[PDB]
Write a protein that binds this DNA or RNA. Structure first.
Lengths: 84, 98, 106, 93, 97, 78, 104, 93
DNA sequence: ATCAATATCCACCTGCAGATTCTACCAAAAGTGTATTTGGAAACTGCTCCATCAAAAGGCATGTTCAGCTGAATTCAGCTGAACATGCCTTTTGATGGAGCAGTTTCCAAATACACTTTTGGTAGAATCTGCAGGTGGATATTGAT
DNA sequence: ATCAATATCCACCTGCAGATTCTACCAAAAGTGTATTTGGAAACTGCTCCATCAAAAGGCATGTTCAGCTGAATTCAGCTGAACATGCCTTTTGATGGAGCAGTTTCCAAATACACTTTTGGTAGAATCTGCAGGTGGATATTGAT
């Protein structure tokens, strides 16, 4: 298809700021946005790593929402609303 | 006049606003792209139910929002009001994450 | 005639189905008593009812007739016991509005 | 291919508590996740209890202890009531 | 005469106790507390000595870790003294609240 | 009894935890916390005891309880 | 003739299997080799811990591995530390004092 | 009145990796708790896997995927190696 | 950074006892060997649902400016918490009992699994019903400058 | 205090996407009458648990003294928030092909289920031992003070 690169920067400063706003944050140091990206990547990596492991185990090529739900449960980040 | 809200008034408006709503805050397409990029660096030729991408975005946004709440506590504890990497690290450490 | 075990137990939740799900969990290599399915269906029903009660109220408080995930979230985070019991993430639930004193103008 | 749900029963219980109130599909989805979750936990704790006591069978007694672990305070008391009651009702044929 | 400056014996104790593995709570007061707490759940109970020791180990592990996070929270606040707000912050971030 | 958990013992615990200076109010706080901990663990343990129709809390009771609280302990049966 | 021998393991393939037949729900079965695989896993990880711990004891001029050694080996190792968020009774903690807490 | 324990096998493995080193009873205790813990974790994940995929047999494939899921990389690589080796050797004789 | 003294810590070596490691005979698993039972892999294929493409429009992200007020640095003194030696009680230890009671058997009824034949209740759609999202516009704050 | 500038409401409006309701069979529930167990119920052993006792020695509780830490007050450089201009790219509507789930069959390889024969690991007894905890006496560290 087309090379995927730097998509972490897709997580814009205004989106991160919104997220902190819901998180109840009034003021944000300029260094947050990169930190946050860092943290998000780790989070995503771990979940996706597990989800794919489920995909591969089921000899499938398609990552199902169930794969992510199991993945999430493993990470102790249980999610309601997709599990069916 | 011209007219300016004092620094911090809009910020508080936004806290009320986003605390009121429930819609995802990260734009959908970029997030999908980030997901596909990370997955791809694990196993090539992968596909995703749109559902799976959404599950991931929900999980992730929930995660960041709670993380920011903890971070905001560490900032306050430091007798500050601006959150800093210091805080995010303190929270994540105490959460036993790192 | 046939009386369903749910009816027999005075329950809206499916005692038979739950007994089947317990056989298939399971033990392992073991068996499920006649009453375990009943006791389970009763707990599950009771908790669905506790949740639906609080959620429904919240839905009322916002002048709407139909429970959304937001409502479910308000009800669950609002109640000490449900909040403790349920550390799941509710897709579409948002958070409970809360700003700290120190953040509020002086 | 039929795939089961708890929607029918959540819906019944809903009409019982708030007979005026509906539930959107996403809400019902959450509700289903909730039920399967607590079912899982109860079943798990029960199978462990049975294991710890060299018992091969899971009875209402297992479910009840499982519910005592797991459920906090008032929830637990009421749950125990409702269960015990459904069980005594069920036995008295 | 002779006297150590405040902080010095403290650091000395930190070194010593971080070196040892011994339980730092006296056994009997602890057993007594365990028994009293338990009395409010089921009466006339007996305890394997192994169970009391398990409890004490679990406890002291817990309190030690918690003190670590607490100390971190005090350091966040540019202090050197831990206070109850530190333990509070720690316990909150942990989700124990 | 909780007061039986003495200041110098809590000092010791803090010390192992790397603490140099301790506020006066820490001891009562620590007691409260330790009490909640012991309550939460023992309650579960005793629930296992009663389920096993015993009058004696076994170490395994405590181990299972601890495991349920996500406080898994090694050295007493698991 | 024992399956542990056949597999070339110290750990009991037979016992591991007998324990696995109590995890397969009802109507559940266990592969002939699952027992071998798990046995292998357990043995390997036991070997890893025991090595690192024996090192901690040699570096301490003693012959017998104590729990303190087990603790030092676990926490001293990134992976083991990650995997074992248990509490090693009688292991204490690893000595560590924060920069800002030292004098001058 | 019997009570099985991995003590023997732990001791054996000890003597392979450190024939000079002994082990205290409390340490041997830790080792037991360790083996039981990891065993339960593996077993659990394996049964879960088989469930998810509507299987009834727990094969070495469930064990392996479960190992990938539970053990941090590198420990997981080596554990996979050991497992596959054990199985090939077992299937040859 | 030295000149002293007070205490702390550190290595080397020592000797016994509480723990090991080593030895020795009976049940309960682990291996063999035969006869079914069955799960789920290999093979067609119906048919969701995923990736991709197109194209238009405005909701947002980006970038700059400008200055408000926040974090960070400095100084400072009240008073808290550490060090300490002083004086005493409660924890610790350790044989005795006694006995409460976990664990182990040895046993029949209650209770569960089966295995077949009916008898519904739930599910996947069609098909009606309506909340409410989303767009208004003026009432009521809420802010921030003179 | 004002008014001026914006933002925040709150309620009324209505057709549409999304519920709630009406409809057809498969899977799964219930009722049968066989079959097997299991766990509870008693009656007794042994471990191991509570309870005194009768003390040395710890280890804790006490009051003094003051060092040094916390927090309060004060300044200011400049980071970050608010607002604005500009225009990109996400969003939204819709269609297309075909990858790939996933629903079915047919049926060897692999699993269970016996019934036996051995084997081994758990037990509770013996035969060493590691190293704790206590000696020097020798440098180190710390704190007052040239």
């Amino acid at each position: 298809r087309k090379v995927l690169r730097d998509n972490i920067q897709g997580i814009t400063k205004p989106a991160i700021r919104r997220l902190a706003r819901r998180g109840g944050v009034k003021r944000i140091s300029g260094l947050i946005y990169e930190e946050t990206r860092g943290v998000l990547k780790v989070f995503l990596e771990n979940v996706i790593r597990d989800a794919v492991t489920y995909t591969e185990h089921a000899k499938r090529k398609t990552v199902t929402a169930m794969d992510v739900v199991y993945a999430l449960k493993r990470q102790g980040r249980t999610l309601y609303g997709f599990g069916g | 006049k011209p007219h300016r809200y004092r620094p911090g008034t809009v910020a508080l408006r936004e806290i009320r606003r986003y605390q009121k709503s429930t819609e995802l805050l990260i734009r959908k397409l970029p997030f999908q792209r980030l997901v596909r990029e990370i997955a791809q660096d694990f196993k090539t030729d992968l596909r995703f139910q749109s559902s799976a991408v959404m599950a991931l975005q929900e999980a992730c946004e929930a995660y960041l929002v709670g993380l920011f709440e903890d971070t905001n506590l560490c900032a306050i504890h430091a007798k500050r009001v601006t959150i800093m990497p210091k805080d995010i690290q303190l929270a994540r450490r105490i959460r036993g994450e790192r | 005639k046939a009386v369903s075990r749910s009816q027999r137990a005075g329950l809206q939740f499916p005692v038979g189905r739950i007994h089947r799900h317990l056989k298939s969990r399971t033990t392992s290599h073991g068996r499920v008593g006649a009453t375990a399915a009943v006791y389970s269906a009763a707990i599950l029903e009771y908790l669905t009812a506790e949740v639906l009660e609080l959620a429904g109220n919240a839905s009322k408080d916002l002048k709407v007739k139909r429970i959304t995930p937001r409502h479910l979230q308000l009800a669950i985070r609002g109640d000490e016991e449900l909040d403790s019991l349920i550390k799941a993430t509710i897709a579409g639930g948002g958070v409970i509005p809360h700003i700290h004193k120190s953040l509020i103008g002086k | 291919s039929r795939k089961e749900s708890y929607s029918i029963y959540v819906y019944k219980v809903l009409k019982q508590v708030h007979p005026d109130t509906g539930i959107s599909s996403k809400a019902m989805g959450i509700m289903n996740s909730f039920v399967n979750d607590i079912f899982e936990r109860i079943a798990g704790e029960a199978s462990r209890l049975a294991h710890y006591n060299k018992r091969s069978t899971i009875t209402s007694r297992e479910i009840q202890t499982a519910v005592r672990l797991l459920l906090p305070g008032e929830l637990a008391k009421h749950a125990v009531s409702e269960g015990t009651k459904a069980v005594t009702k069920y036995t008295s044929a």
